[PDB]
């Protein structure tokens, strides 16, 4: 039925072609202290963000899920301005990053007060059923993240909170996996606490190339995402070549009703402008919102995937996920 | 001669009685993502902050150094408003927190671009010689922090940057030590890179009770601080009893020209409001800006310390430090 976007509630029928994981705004926790050399280009950032939405709208996309966590400069009103100008639908999130690239100390401190997991739940409920700050916007998904090879104590507080929240709300859960680890464990641990696998998207699965690992995850009946198309050389991540050679294994075996695709782009960066060093800067030349529809998809056809199947992924699956 | 406060440059002669370490505003990194339940009480916070300044002004304090790091919600314009209303002098900082209660990922990421330590220097120079963001305020001190028993790789980038900045500027360095560790190592590592010990305040020394350790540190000719008076029972911290019994050892042995005192208070908290749990909330009942002048000081007299000596600590030392 209905899904909360930044422009208030929307019928899931009208979601349409959907990218599951892209950032308009993103900054690594700590960017706020580099304000002096990295002040936020308020009205140019908006100009770039609308550039990316119009760039997405023209390949038939009607909906983006933006899972930018609360500590990476999530900005729902900004996003609201973008949708108001483009008509694109934008679903935002409620969540923190993970230990390795998040902001532990604050909730670490409350953990000592004994109230952290309640506070995270209370925050999740608030942002899902009341609205984010005074923006009036509710998050449409819960963002979760785990570390490499571990779901830390701190992360588990959020997983628990997240599972208990979803039971109270029916919110979709979207997750981050670190370097192709902890897919199954994530699914397992959320299902243990009463989350519903049909309302769960294990993310960054494209970060493992052994399809055995994906199947172990799909077996929970959760959705999985290859949401990092375009990112190469970094994090130890595999090439777009590996992804497709890993993606195709799961398509012929008819799992497409559990797979969705994205790029995990950052269209505007918070903090100090930077430019990638020259080894790095050519491997990730393809990391942009165009990448899938002009490259990844044609490649998929040449290896024989029905356009019907893809529609399950970009339209059916997301419509399914949110209902 | 001159020191940069939030109200522009000021003659060091007019610093006067000085608290070396107190926060008006503070939040643990991550507080920004708890915005919905923890929105910043803009104009009440200002009302509380002026309460604390007026409360400090009446025990003769004319100057506070507020070392709130860039990632813990440092707010120089806010501070500026406080001084403009009270006439108090407020010197702010340029720094990041340490790894355990800091926000590593952002500078961690730049470390991979190969430019982090330059960027930290460039940030330090900017905030010391040009101004913080568009506030026009320059930091008067550099804030540095290390972990328990370790000065991590990440922290050393900032120490190096900090030492090279001070050489270019003459800025005072103020530091944080974790649980009474790394005093000497900090001094040693800064002196190695050309920092001047007479422009350095090793902080949280009151976190070690073995005076042997302090002397090892004082031997570098750096200043040291017992800046956590009132914080008891927490972090592994020692009682105000231990501090004084540790402080007195260094006074009779005539080091007072290297010691200064504070409380390290947080007069307004960013993030979700909270009550300290029932055990904790008793031990730290004394953690407030009044604590020193009404309690710690009388206690010091009864054990026979000349008011002249104290003046070296609250007036002479700081005046010395900044010139
Ligand atoms: Fe992402
Ligand atoms: Fe402090
Ligand atoms: Mn991610
Ligand atoms: Mn500190």
TrEMBL record, chains A, B:
Known cofactor(s): a divalent metal cation
Query: Which InterPro entries does the protein's record reference?
Result: Metal_Hydrolase, Phosphotriesterase
Q: Where does Zn(2+) 2 bind?
A: 143, 176, 204
The cofactor note reads: Binds 2 divalent metal cations per subunit.
Which of this chain's residues are annotated to bind Fe(3+) 1? 21, 23, 143, 264
Tagged with keyword Hydrolase? yes
- Binding positions for Zn(2+) 1? 21, 23, 143, 264
Modification sites for N6-carboxylysine = 143
Q: Name the SUPFAM superfamilies for this protein.
A: Metallo-dependent hydrolases (SSF51556)
- Signal sequence span is none
Q: Keyword annotations for this protein?
A: Hydrolase, Metal-binding, Zinc
Asked if Disulfide bond is a keyword of the record, the answer is no
Binding positions for Mn(2+) per the UniProt entry: 143, 176, 204, 264
Name the residues that bind Fe(3+) 2: 143, 176, 204
Stored Pfam families: PTE
Q: What class of enzyme is it?
A: hydrolase
EC number(s) on file: 3.5.-.-
Q: Supply the CDD domains for this chain.
A: PTE
What Gene Ontology terms describe what this protein does at the molecular function level? hydrolase activity; zinc ion binding
Listed PANTHER family: PHOSPHOTRIESTERASE-RELATED, PHOSPHOTRIESTERASE-RELATED PROTEIN
Family per record: Belongs to the metallo-dependent hydrolases superfamily. Phosphotriesterase family.
> Under what name is this protein listed?
Phosphotriesterase
């Amino acid at each position: 039925e209905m899904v909360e976007t930044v422009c208030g509630p929307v019928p899931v029928e009208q979601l349409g072609k959907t990218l599951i994981h892209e950032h308009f705004l993103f900054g690594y926790p700590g960017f706020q202290g580099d304000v002096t050399r990295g002040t936020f280009r308020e009205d140019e950032s908006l100009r770039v963000a609308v550039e990316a939405a119009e760039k997405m709208k023209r390949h038939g996309i009607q909906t983006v899920v933006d899972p930018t966590p609360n500590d990476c400069g999530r900005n729902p009103a900004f996003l609201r301005r973008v949708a108001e100008e483009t008509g694109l639908n934008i679903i935002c999130a409620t969540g923190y990053y993970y230990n390795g690239e998040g902001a532990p100390p604050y909730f670490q401190f409350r953990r000592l007060l004994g109230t952290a997991e309640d506070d995270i739940y209370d925050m999740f409920m608030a942002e899902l059923t009341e609205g984010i700050a005074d923006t009036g916007i509710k998050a449409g998904v819960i963002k979760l993240a785990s570390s490499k090879g571990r779901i830390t104590e701190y992360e588990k507080m959020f997983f628990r909170a997240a599972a208990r929240a979803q039971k109270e709300t029916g919110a979709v859960i979207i997750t981050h996996t670190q370097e192709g680890t902890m897919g199954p464990e994530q699914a397992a641990y959320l299902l243990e606490h009463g989350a519903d696998p049909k309302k769960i998207v294990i993310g960054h699965m494209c970060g493992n190339t052994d399809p055995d690992y994906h199947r172990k995850t799909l077996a929970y009946g959760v959705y999985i995402a290859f949401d990092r198309f375009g990112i190469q050389g970094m994090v130890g991540a595999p090439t777009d070549e590996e992804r497709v050679r890993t993606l195709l294994a799961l398509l012929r075996d008819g799992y497409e009703k559990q797979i969705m695709l994205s790029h995990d782009t950052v269209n505007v960066w918070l903090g100090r402008p930077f430019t990638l060093p020259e080894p790095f800067a050519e491997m990730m030349k393809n990391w942009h919102v165009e990448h899938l529809f002009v490259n990844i998809i044609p490649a998929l056809k040449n290896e024989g995937i029905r356009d019907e199947v893809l529609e399950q992924m970009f339209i059916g699956n997301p419509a399914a996920l949110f209902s």
